[PDB]
Design an enzyme around this catalytic site. Structure first.
Site, PDB file in Angstrom:
ATOM      1  N   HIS A  36     -32.907  24.461  65.040  1.00 56.56           N
ATOM      2  CA  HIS A  36     -31.605  24.294  64.427  1.00 56.56           C
ATOM      3  C   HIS A  36     -31.118  25.623  63.874  1.00 56.56           C
ATOM      4  CE1 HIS A  36     -33.646  23.468  60.240  1.00 56.56           C
ATOM      5  NE2 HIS A  36     -32.608  24.154  59.878  1.00 56.56           N
ATOM      6  N   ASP A  63     -37.351  20.208  66.934  1.00 58.61           N
ATOM      7  CA  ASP A  63     -36.683  21.276  66.232  1.00 58.61           C
ATOM      8  C   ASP A  63     -37.536  22.528  66.437  1.00 58.61           C
ATOM      9  OD1 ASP A  63     -35.045  22.736  64.514  1.00 58.61           O
ATOM     10  OD2 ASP A  63     -35.496  21.568  62.758  1.00 58.61           O
ATOM     11  N   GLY A 141     -32.790  27.676  53.799  1.00 58.87           N
ATOM     12  CA  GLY A 141     -33.107  29.047  54.165  1.00 58.87           C
ATOM     13  C   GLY A 141     -34.568  29.226  54.561  1.00 58.87           C
ATOM     14  N   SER A 143     -36.171  27.061  56.461  1.00 56.55           N
ATOM     15  CA  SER A 143     -36.314  26.559  57.817  1.00 56.55           C
ATOM     16  C   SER A 143     -36.757  27.656  58.764  1.00 56.55           C
ATOM     17  CB  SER A 143     -34.992  26.011  58.302  1.00 56.55           C
ATOM     18  OG  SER A 143     -34.669  24.854  57.531  1.00 56.55           O
ATOM     19  N   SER A 159     -38.863  22.519  59.161  1.00 56.11           N
ATOM     20  CA  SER A 159     -37.734  21.852  59.759  1.00 56.11           C
ATOM     21  C   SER A 159     -36.769  21.426  58.691  1.00 56.11           C
ATOM     22  CB  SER A 159     -38.160  20.615  60.539  1.00 56.11           C
ATOM     23  OG  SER A 159     -37.014  19.976  61.119  1.00 56.11           O
TER      24      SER A 159
END
Length: 198
Positions: A36, A63, A141, A143, A159
Site C-alpha cells: 500500500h 500487502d 508512517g 507501514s 501493514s
C-alpha cells in the site's frame, strides 16, 4: 544511502513509509516494504535522493512490495533500534506467543508478542487476508517497517493497526492493540528474493 530496516523513505515526493529488509534478486539490490506504500514504478527517495522504484506490489488482498534499488545503494543486514542495530540472521517464522519487535520511522523500535495469525484487515481499499497480529504498538508512517525477533529472525513487514486519533496505538494497553504485518516468506518466494543476512 545505506539501506537499514526501519528507516524512512518517501514515495513520489509525498507519502512516507519505512524500509522492511534489504534483499537481492540476482545482481539487483532491493528492499521489501508494504504494497500500500506505492504503485509500480513509483519513485522511492531516502534523505531526498532517489534510490530506486517500486518493482512489484500486491495491495489489497495481500500487502507486499519490493523496490529495486540502483547499484549505488548499500544493502545492510540490519534493522534500526534507536542508535543501535539488530542483525538479520534468517527468516524462521515464529509461533504465536513469541516476542517480536518492529522498527519504523514514526514510533521507532517497539516490542510485544505475536497474538494471532491469519487475520483479515478491512482497509478502505478492500480486505487484506493472512496477516499476523502482534501487540507491539505502531503508528502511521511505520507501514512497511521490519518486524523481527531479538534473535534476528525476520518475520514480516508492517501493514496496519488500530491507530487512535493521535496516529498510533501506543497510548492504549497492549491487550487492546492490534498491529498487523504481512509475513516475509511468501514475499520472498513470490518475487524470488534472497534476504541479506549477517
Amino acid at each position: 544511502a545505506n539501506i537499514v530496516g526501519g528507516i524512512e523513505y518517501s514515495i513520489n515526493n509525498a507519502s512516507l513509509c519505512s524500509v522492511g529488509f534489504s534483499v537481492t534478486r540476482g545482481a539487483t539490490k532491493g528492499f521489501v516494504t508494504a504494497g500500500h506504500c506505492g504503485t509500480v514504478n513509483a519513485t522511492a527517495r531516502i534523505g531526498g535522493a532517489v534510490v530506486g522504484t517500486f518493482a512489484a506490489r500486491v495491495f489489497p488482498g495481500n500487502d507486499r512490495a519490493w523496490v529495486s534499488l540502483t547499484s549505488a545503494q548499500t544493502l545492510l543486514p540490519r534493522v534500526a533500534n534507536g542508535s543501535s542495530f539488530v542483525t538479520v540472521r534468517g527468516s524462521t517464522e515464529a509461533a504465536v506467543g513469541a516476542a517480536v519487535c518492529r522498527s519504523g520511522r514514526t514510533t521507532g523500535y517497539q516490542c510485544g508478542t505475536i497474538t494471532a495469525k491469519n487475520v483479515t484487515a478491512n482497509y478502505a481499499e478492500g480486505a487484506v487476508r493472512g496477516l499476523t497480529q502482534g501487540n507491539a504498538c505502531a503508528g502511521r508512517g511505520d507501514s512497511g517497517g521490519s518486524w523481527i525477533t531479538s534473535a534476528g529472525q525476520a518475520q514480516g513487514v508492517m501493514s496496519g493497526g488500530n491507530v487512535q486519533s493521535n496516529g498510533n496505538n501506543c497510548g492504549i494497553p497492549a491487550s487492546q492493540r492490534s498491529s498487523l504485518f504481512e509475513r516475509l516468506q511468501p514475499i520472498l518466494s513470490q518475487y524470488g528474493l534472497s534476504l541479506v543476512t549477517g
